[PDB]
Amino acid sequence: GMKSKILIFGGTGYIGNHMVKGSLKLGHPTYVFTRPNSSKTTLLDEFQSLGAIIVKGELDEHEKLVELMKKVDVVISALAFPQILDQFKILEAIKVAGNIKRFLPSDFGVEEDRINALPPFEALIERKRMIRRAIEEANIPYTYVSANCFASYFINYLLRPYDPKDEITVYGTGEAKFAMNYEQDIGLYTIKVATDPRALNRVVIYRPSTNIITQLELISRWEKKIGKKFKKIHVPEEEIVALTKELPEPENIPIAILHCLFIDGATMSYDFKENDVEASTLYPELKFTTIDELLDIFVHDPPPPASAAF
Amino acid sequence: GMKSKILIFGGTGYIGNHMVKGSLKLGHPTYVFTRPNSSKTTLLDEFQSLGAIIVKGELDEHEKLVELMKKVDVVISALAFPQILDQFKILEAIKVAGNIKRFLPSDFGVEEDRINALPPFEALIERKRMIRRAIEEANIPYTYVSANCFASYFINYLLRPYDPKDEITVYGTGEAKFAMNYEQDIGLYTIKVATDPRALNRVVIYRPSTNIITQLELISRWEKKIGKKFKKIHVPEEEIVALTKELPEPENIPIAILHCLFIDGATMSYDFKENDVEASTLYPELKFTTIDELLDIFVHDPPPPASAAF
Ligand SMILES: NC(=O)c1ccc[n+]([C@@H]2O[C@H](COP(=O)([O-])OP(=O)(O)OC[C@H]3O[C@@H](n4cnc5c(N)ncnc54)[C@H](OP(=O)(O)O)[C@@H]3O)[C@@H](O)[C@H]2O)c1
Numbered sequence: 001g002m003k004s005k006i007l008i009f010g011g012t013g014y015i016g017n018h019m020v021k022g023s024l025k026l027g028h029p030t031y032v033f034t035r036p037n038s039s040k041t042t043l044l045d046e047f048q049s050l051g052a053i054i055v056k057g058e059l060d061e062h063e064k065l066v067e068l069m070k071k072v073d074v075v076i077s078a079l080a081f082p083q084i085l086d087q088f089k090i091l092e093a094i095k096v097a098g099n100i101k102r103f104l105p106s107d108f109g110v111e112e113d114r115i116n117a118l119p120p121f122e123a124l125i126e127r128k129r130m131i132r133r134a135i136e137e138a139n140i141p142y143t144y145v146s147a148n149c150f151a152s153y154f155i156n157y158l159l160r161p162y163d164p165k166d167e168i169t170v171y172g173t174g175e176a177k178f179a180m181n182y183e184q185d186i187g188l189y190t191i192k193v194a195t196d197p198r199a200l201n202r203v204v205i206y207r208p209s210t211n212i213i214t215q216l217e218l219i220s221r222w223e224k225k226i227g228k229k230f231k232k233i234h235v236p237e238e239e240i241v242a243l244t245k246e247l248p249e250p251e252n253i254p255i256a257i258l259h260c261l262f263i264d265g266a267t268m269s270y271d272f273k274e275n276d277v278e279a280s281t282l283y284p285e286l287k288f289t290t291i292d293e294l295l296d297i298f299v300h301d302p303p304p305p306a307s308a309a310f
Numbered sequence: 311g312m313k314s315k316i317l318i319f320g321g322t323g324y325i326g327n328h329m330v331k332g333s334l335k336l337g338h339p340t341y342v343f344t345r346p347n348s349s350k351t352t353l354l355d356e357f358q359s360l361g362a363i364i365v366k367g368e369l370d371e372h373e374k375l376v377e378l379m380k381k382v383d384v385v386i387s388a389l390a391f392p393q394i395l396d397q398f399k400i401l402e403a404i405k406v407a408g409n410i411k412r413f414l415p416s417d418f419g420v421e422e423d424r425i426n427a428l429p430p431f432e433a434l435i436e437r438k439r440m441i442r443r444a445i446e447e448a449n450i451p452y453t454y455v456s457a458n459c460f461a462s463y464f465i466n467y468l469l470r471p472y473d474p475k476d477e478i479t480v481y482g483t484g485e486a487k488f489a490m491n492y493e494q495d496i497g498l499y500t501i502k503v504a505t506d507p508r509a510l511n512r513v514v515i516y517r518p519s520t521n522i523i524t525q526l527e528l529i530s531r532w533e534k535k536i537g538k539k540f541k542k543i544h545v546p547e548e549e550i551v552a553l554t555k556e557l558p559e560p561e562n563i564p565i566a567i568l569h570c571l572f573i574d575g576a577t578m579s580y581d582f583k584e585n586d587v588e589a590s591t592l593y594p595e596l597k598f599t600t601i602d603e604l605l606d607i608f609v610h611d612p613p614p615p616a617s618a619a620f
C-alpha cells in the first residue's frame with residue numbers, strides 16, 4: 001500500500017542479502033540491482049521466490065539508473081570496498097531523478113567521521129567520507145549506518161569454530177572492547193531505520209548493550225560453551241603496525257582493520273553525540289540477537305566463514 | 311585411435327584447465343570429472359566444445375569412479391590443497407580398476423621429497439608425500455611433476471602489475487633464486503610426460519634455463535620493460551618466520567610458502583639426481599615460454615591475478 005519502494009545495490013552481497021530479505025519480510029516492494037554476469041544465480045532465484053524484482057545491469061548505465069530511480073523511494077547501497085567511489089554513479093542518478101526520499105550509502109562498519117586508522121584502512125574510509133560529503137552538499141536525505149562488527153563474520157574470524165586446533169590467535173593484548181551484531185539483524189534494522197523519520201539525516205549506530213565484548217572475554221565464553229580450553233597466542237601491536245607498512249595491498253588492509261577494531265578498539269572508543277541514534281532503543285517489538293545467542297547458534301548450526309573483497 | 315585416454319580430476323581448476331586444453335590439443339580423448347554444483351559452467355561448455363567428455367560426480371561415488379577408471383588409461387589429479395588426502399578416493403578406484411597405465415598426483419610445485427619447509431607448509435607437503443608413498447607401495451605406474459612456480463600467478467603476486475603503486479614488496483633479501491613456468495606450458499608438458507616412457511615412474515622437474523631468476527632481478531627486468539622505477543620495501547626473514555607461528559590457519563600457509571620459495575630458494579636449492587628428468591630437454595619441437603616472453607605478455611595482454619585455496 002503506502003509501503004516505500006526500496007532499491008538495493010549489492011543486494012546479493014554478504015550483508016546485502018540480509019537487507020533484501022529484511023525488506024521483503026517487512027512488506028516493502030524490493031528492487032535488486034545485479035550485474036548480468038553475477039554468479040549469484042541461486043540467490044537471485046531465492047529473492048525472486050520471495051517477491052523481489054530483479055533488475056540486471058551495470059553501474060555504468062546512467063540512463064537505466066535514472067529511470068529506475070524514478071520508480072522507487074529509498075536507495076540502499078551495500079557495495080564492496082573496490083566499488084566505494086563507484087557509488088558516485090548511483091548518486092548522480094539520484095540527483096537527476098530527484099524523487100528519492102532516503103539514501104543509505106555503503107558504510108555498515110566503523111563510524112568513519114569520528115575515528116582514524118592506519119593508512120591502508122584510512123584510505124578506504126576516506127573514500128566513504130567523500131560519498132557522505134557529496135550527499136550533504138547536494139542536500140540528499142540520508143541515514144548513515146555504523147553497524148559495527150558483523151558477528152558471524154568475526155566469530156568465524158576470531159574463533160575459527162570450524163578448526164579443531166588447540167591454539168587461538170589474539171591480536172594485541174586482547175583487552176580492547178568491540179561491538180558485534182548478527183548479520184540478519186543488521187539487515188532488518190537497516191530497512192527499519194531507512195524509513196523511520198527518527199533516522200532521517202542522522203547517524204545511526206548499532207550498539208546493543210548485550211553485544212559488547214573483548215577478544216579475551218569472547219574466547220572465555222566460547223570455551224565455557226564448548227567445554228574446551230585454548231592456548232592463547234598474541235600478535236604484538238608493533239608487529240601488526242610494521243606489517244601494514246611492509247606488506248603489499250590488499251594484504252595490508254585486513255591487518256590495518258584488525259589494528260583498528262581489536263587493538264585501538266575503534267567501535268567502542270567513543271561516546272554518543274547529541275544527534276546520534278542507537279538503533280536498539282528504537283523498536284520495542286524487536287531486539288538484536290545477543291552474544292550468548294550467537295554462540296549458541298555456532299554450536300547448533302554455525303554459518304560458513306567469509307572474507308570481504310579488497 | 312591408439313591415443314591414450316586421459317581422465318583429469320580438478321580439470322576446471324587454475325592449472326587443471328591448462329592440462330585439459332593441452333590434452334585436447336594433443337589429440338587425446340579427454341574426460342573431465344567435475345562436481346554437480348561447480349560454478350565452472352561456462353568453462354565446462356568450452357571444454358565440451360573442444361571435444362572433452364564431461365563427467366559430473368563426487369569423489370565419494372566409489373562405484374562411479376571405478377567404472378570410469380575402466381574406460382581410461384591415464385589419470386591426472388589437479389586437486390587443491392584442501393583435497394590432498396581426498397586423492398585416496400581416486401587411488402582406491404585406480405587400485406580396484408587395475409587398468410591404469412599412469413597416475414600423476416596433484417603435486418605441480420616444489421619437489422616435496424627433497425625439501426623441507428616451515429610447519430604450515432611442511433604439513434601440506436607431508437600429505438602429498440603420503441599419496442606418493444601409497445602409489446609406490448601399490449606398484450602403480452606414476453610420474454611426479456615438480457612444475458616449480460606458476461609464472462602468471464607469481465608475476466601477479468610479486469610485481470602486482472595491475473597496481474599503479476610506486477613501491478614493491480621484497481621478501482627477505484630478494485637474492486634467493488627460483489624458477490617459474492607459464493601455466494599454459496605446464497599444462498601441455500604435463501600431458502606430454504604422462505605418456506612419455508621416459509617419464510615412467512620418475513620425478514620430472516620443469517626447470518628451463520631461461521626461467522630462473524631472483525626477486526631483485528625480476529623487478530629490474532620489469533622496470534626496464536615498462537620504463538618505471540620502484541622503491542623496494544623488504545620484509546625481513548625473521549619477521550616472516552615469526553608470523554607463521556603466530557598467525558592462524560590458513561593465513562600462515564602463504565607466508566610459510568613465501569619463505570620456502572623466496573627466502574630458502576627451494577625450487578633452486580638442489581642439484582639434479584641421476585634419475586631426475588628435466589622436461590625442457592625432452593621435446594625438440596617444444597619449449598617453455600621464457601621470462602622475457604612472459605613479461606611481454608604482461609605488457610600486451612596480462613592475465614588476471616589468482617589466489618590458491620587453503
Ligand atoms: N562491519 C563489518 O564487519 C563488515 C564486514 C564486511 C563488509 N563490511 C562492509 O559492508 C559493505 C558491503 O560489504 P560486502 O562484503 O557485503 O560486499 P560483497 O558481498 O563483497 O559485495 C556486494 C556486492 O557487489 C556487487 N559487485 C561486486 N563486484 C562488482 C563490480 N566490480 N561492479 C559492480 N558491482 C559489483 C556484487 O553483486 P552482483 O554480483 O549482484 O552484481 C556483490 O554481491 C561494505 O561497505 C563493507 O565495507 C563491513
Ligand SMILES: NC(=O)c1ccc[n+]([C@@H]2O[C@H](COP(=O)([O-])OP(=O)(O)OC[C@H]3O[C@@H](n4cnc5c(N)ncnc54)[C@H](OP(=O)(O)O)[C@@H]3O)[C@@H](O)[C@H]2O)c1
Nearest residue numbers: 320322323324325344345348388389390416419458459460
Ligand atoms: N606451483 C605453483 O606456483 C602453484 C600455484 C597454485 C597451486 N599449486 C598446486 O597446483 C595444484 C592445483 O591447484 P589449483 O589452484 O589449480 O586448484 P583449484 O583451481 O583451487 O582447484 C582445482 C579444482 O578442485 C575442484 N574442487 C574444489 N573443491 C572441491 C571439493 N570440496 N571436492 C572436490 N573437488 C573440489 C574444483 O573443480 P570442480 O568445480 O570442477 O569440481 C576445482 O576447479 C595443487 O597441488 C596446488 O598445490 C601450485
Ligand SMILES: CCOC(=O)[C@H]1C[C@@H]1c1ccc(O)c(OC)c1
Nearest residue numbers: 109110148149253254257258308
Ligand atoms: C579483519 C577481517 O575483516 C576485514 O578486513 C574487513 C571486513 C571487515 C570490516 C570492514 C569495514 C569496517 O568498517 C569494519 O568495521 C566493523 C570491518
Ligand SMILES: CCOC(=O)[C@H]1C[C@@H]1c1ccc(O)c(OC)c1
Nearest residue numbers: 419420458459563564567568618
Ligand atoms: C605465496 C602465494 O602462493 C601460495 O601460497 C601457494 C600457491 C603457491 C604454491 C603452492 C604449492 C607449491 O608447491 C608451490 O611451489 C612453487 C607454490
